[PDB]
Design a protein around this nucleic acid. Structure first.
Ligand SMILES: Nc1ncnc2c1ncn2[C@H]1CC[C@@H](COP(=O)(O)OP(=O)(O)OP(=O)(O)O)O1
Ligand SMILES: [Mg+2]
Ligand SMILES: [Mg+2]
Ligand SMILES: [Mg+2]
Lengths: 105, 680
DNA sequence: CGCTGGCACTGGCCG
DNA sequence: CGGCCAGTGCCAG
């Protein structure tokens, strides 16, 4: 249920998609990123109706993150109509994310 | 004999005022101070000592005190003052000869902490005078509410300055006596603090005389400076900076940027067991946060990172991109980091063609920064050292190497790129007599470059003549030896034929040899045999050295423990030449011999010119611009004079060879032209 | 075991 | 962010 982005697919898969898109900028070497991955898998099944969870691996796609000021990871950018609507950084708990989402959708 | 020291308002280049001076007369055993108003009297005292055929001792007076007094004498009193070289003694020159196994701060110009080994105590205290006086100033100062500025401790005289001056003389005296107590350089029968100048030079070891003359002449060279074409180098900088910008553009398109961990302030811990995981990037836990527009929560840890652009100058980055491209290092370093140099870079192979080609851009990029660094951006760059007279006055330590060789710095005019290398002609042409216009006529001067032919091989010949009855010496004088060695080793260029032998003759490993001449360890072995076999006397000479220095040694771990019979060798002039390692013993012998030969040579050369009536100086007929081990570059007022210098250089060399009874004829090769590019 | 040297640039550490 | 310093690698003879 999760989208896997690339530098070239980013524009049309995110900035030109309809509705909300939850982007996760992560990396294989980060402990916090490894912790949050599990959560995101479930957040995908559940919000299958009003949300799209998409991930971008900053090592394999070095061009996108810079344009956003990535300073820490995992970074969760919430896009709506090709525009960053919200954003939070760190390994949120399954119980904290759902809130962040609910309170923004 | 008197010991003296002076305090002035600035370095030689711009000194303009005499502050104070102190003199200790061994004859009266008393100390005498001289304040600003006593400048004429201080100078008289010195000339009085000269009128008696006496000696004046300074610590580093050959480069500063003596020439500073001449300048200050003309500016402040309209007096002509010129201490004769034969009346001056320099404890720094002496200290450097008798403790040549030790480093020194070059009178505070270097920081003692970055120097290896120990330092002679008295000399240390002397080289730290200024800084210690400065620290006292800022202190005495701030304890007054004032503010410290630039280097105001030198603008005016003061009793604190007077005391240090006195202290320097008392320490210089102590330093003198400890040096005079070394029976190897000064025979114990004579009390050297109580004899005329002629006795001091004639009864002491010949090295004491050679070091003071060389020092006196090289201080003159430093004062002459080297005519430098600033405009040519500024325009060279522009070319290179442009070429640098383009290679970066290309490379940064090929190798993109990436993120790295930075600012992690907490050990990462497994959520289930609590087990610490050091290998993971450090994290950071927010505290606070949880609409709340802020972008943080509370117990939600993250990993702080930074964006980093590919930097061709960083060996780390290079090593990281090429491995990702498919490279697997085979050569690593002590610390386990892979080796990234031109040698391995030239042999790295990858699939992506663009990446493979990028490698050349990387090698060209590094070489260009090497040029920009030396000529423009580095701390000791040429463009930063060019004086107002259009000349660069590089510093020279006449006896800075263990072997007796000199050392050069600020900047090192002895490491300028050769004409047969990337951008060498431009660098080389920028230094030259043509860039000096005559004070009267305004016409350019001319250069005379003289270099000693096959120097160290002739030194080898000399030392092995007692084993081969003069054979090697005979073959040497049968055409260029380096060219006869080139074809023999089936080598490409003559410079490379030189690198070979000198690597061969001083114990370079088979691999090292093969690399230079650049096949495998098999090549660098057949070549070691071919030449070592074509001359077995080199084997005899090596054994003697060993049997003369070493008694036996171990190999306990990564180091070396040796039992010596004597850890030094006697130089061509009788001084002690410290032998750091048994394997380098031969090198010490030949390099030391060559050095001492070139030192007497330049000394005898200038002495013969001044004898032919020529005047040394830009206001004369010729001027020493540089001395690079076995090469000298001299500026001449007319083509006619450059012809004489050259001719004369050859006469002096043959003289030196006779002086020390060398078993191999010595020769020189001179070139006349407008700059260093054409004169080497 | 090349050896003598100077020196530049990167990257970790700290006031 | 500039000073201290180790680790590296190049320039000359
Ligand atoms: N790679 C080296 N290793 C050790 N010593 C060297 C090396 N290259 C040169 N030397 C020594 C040899 C004597 C001194 C000056 O050498 P220089 O470069 O003038 O060559 P050379 O004097 O042997 O012959 P030439 O007549 O070609 O100048 O430095
Ligand atoms: Mg002094
Ligand atoms: Mg030579
Ligand atoms: Mg030379």
């Amino acid at each position: 249920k999760i989208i896997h982005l690339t530098d070239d697919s980013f524009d049309t898969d995110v900035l030109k998609a309809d509705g909300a898109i939850l982007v996760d900028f992560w990396a294989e070497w980060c402990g916090p990123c490894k912790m949050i991955a599990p959560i995101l898998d479930e957040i995908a099944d559940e919000y299958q109706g009003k949300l799209t969870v998409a991930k971008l691996n900053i090592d394999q796609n070095p061009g996108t993150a810079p344009k956003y000021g990535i300073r820490g990871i995992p970074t969760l950018l919430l896009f709506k109509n090709g525009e960053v609507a919200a954003t939070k950084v760190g390994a949120l708990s399954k119980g904290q994310l759902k809130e962040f989402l609910d309170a923004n959708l | 004999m008197i010991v003296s020291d002076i305090e002035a308002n600035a370095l030689l280049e711009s000194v303009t005022k005499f502050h104070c001076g102190v003199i200790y007369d061994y004859s009266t055993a008393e100390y005498v101070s001289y304040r600003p108003s006593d400048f004429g009297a201080y100078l008289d005292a010195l000339e009085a000592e000269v009128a008696r055929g006496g000696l004046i001792v300074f610590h580093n007076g050959h480069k500063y005190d003596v020439p500073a007094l001449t300048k200050l004498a003309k500016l402040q009193l309209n007096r002509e003052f010129h201490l004769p070289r034969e009346n001056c003694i320099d404890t720094l020159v002496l200290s450097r000869l008798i403790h040549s196994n030790l480093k020194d701060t070059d009178m505070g110009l270097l920081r003692s902490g970055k120097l290896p080994g120990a330092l002679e105590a008295w000399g240390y205290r002397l080289g730290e005078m200024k800084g210690e006086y400065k620290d006292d100033f800022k202190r005495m100062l701030e304890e007054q509410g004032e503010e410290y500025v630039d280097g105001m401790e030198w603008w005016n005289f003061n009793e604190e300055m007077m005391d240090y001056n006195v202290q320097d003389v008392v320490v210089t005296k102590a330093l003198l006596e400890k040096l005079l107590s070394d029976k190897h350089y000064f025979p114990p029968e004579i009390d050297f603090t109580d004899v005329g100048y002629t006795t001091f030079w004639s009864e002491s070891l010949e090295a004491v005389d050679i070091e003071h003359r060389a020092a006196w002449l090289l201080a003159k060279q430093e004062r002459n400076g080297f005519p430098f074409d600033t405009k040519a180098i500024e325009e060279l900088y522009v070319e290179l900076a442009a070429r640098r910008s383009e290679l970066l553009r290309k490379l940064t398109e090929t190798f993109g940027s990436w993120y790295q961990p930075k600012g992690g302030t907490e050990m990462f811990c497994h959520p289930r067991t609590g087990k610490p995981l050091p290998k993971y990037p450090r994290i950071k836990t927010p505290k606070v946060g949880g609409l709340d527009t802020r972008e943080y929560v509370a117990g939600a840890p993250y990993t702080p990172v930074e964006h980093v652009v590919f930097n061709p100058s960083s060996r780390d980055h290079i090593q990281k991109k090429l491995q990702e491209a498919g490279w697997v290092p085979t050569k690593y370093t002590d610390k386990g980091a892979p080796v990234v140099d031109d040698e391995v870079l030239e042999g790295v192979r990858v699939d992506d063609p663009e990446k493979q080609a990028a490698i050349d851009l990387i090698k060209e990029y590094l070489m260009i920064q090497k040029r920009i660094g030396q000529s423009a951006e580095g701390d000791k760059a040429w463009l930063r050292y060019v004086a107002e007279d259009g000349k660069i006055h590089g510093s020279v330590n006449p006896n800075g190497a263990v072997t007796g060789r000199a050392t050069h710095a600020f900047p090192n005019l002895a490491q300028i790129p050769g004409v047969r290398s990337p951008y060498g002609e431009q660098c080389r042409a920028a230094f030259g007599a043509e860039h000096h216009l005559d004070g009267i006529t305004g016409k350019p001067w001319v250069q005379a470059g003289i270099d000693a032919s096959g120097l160290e091989l002739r030194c080898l010949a000399h030392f092995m003549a007692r084993f081969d009855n003069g054979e090697y010496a005979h073959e040497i004088l049968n055409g260029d030896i380096h060219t006869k060695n080139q074809i023999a080793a089936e080598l490409p260029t003559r410079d490379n034929a030189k690198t070979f032998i000198y690597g061969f003759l001083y114990g370079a490993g088979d691999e090292a040899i093969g690399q230079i001449v650049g096949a495998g360890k098999e090549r660098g072995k057949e070549l070691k045999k071919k030449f070592l076999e074509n001359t077995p006397a080199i084997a005899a000479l090596r054994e003697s050295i060993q049997q003369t220095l070493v008694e036996s040694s171990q190999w306990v771990a990564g180091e070396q423990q040796v039992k010596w019979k004597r850890r030094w060798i006697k130089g061509l002039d009788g001084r002690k030449v410290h032998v750091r390692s048994p394997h380098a013993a031969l090198n010490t012998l030949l390099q030391s011999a060559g050095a001492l030969i070139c030192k007497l040579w330049i000394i005898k050369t200038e002495e013969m010119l001044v004898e032919k009536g020529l005047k040394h100086g830009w206001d004369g007929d010729f001027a020493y611009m540089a001395w690079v081990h076995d090469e000298i570059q001299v500026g001449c007022r007319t083509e006619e004079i450059a012809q004489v210098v050259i001719e004369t250089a050859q006469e002096a060399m043959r003289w030196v060879g006779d002086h020390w009874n060398f078993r191999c004829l010595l020769d020189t090769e001179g070139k006349m032209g407008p700059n260093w590019a054409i004169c080497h």
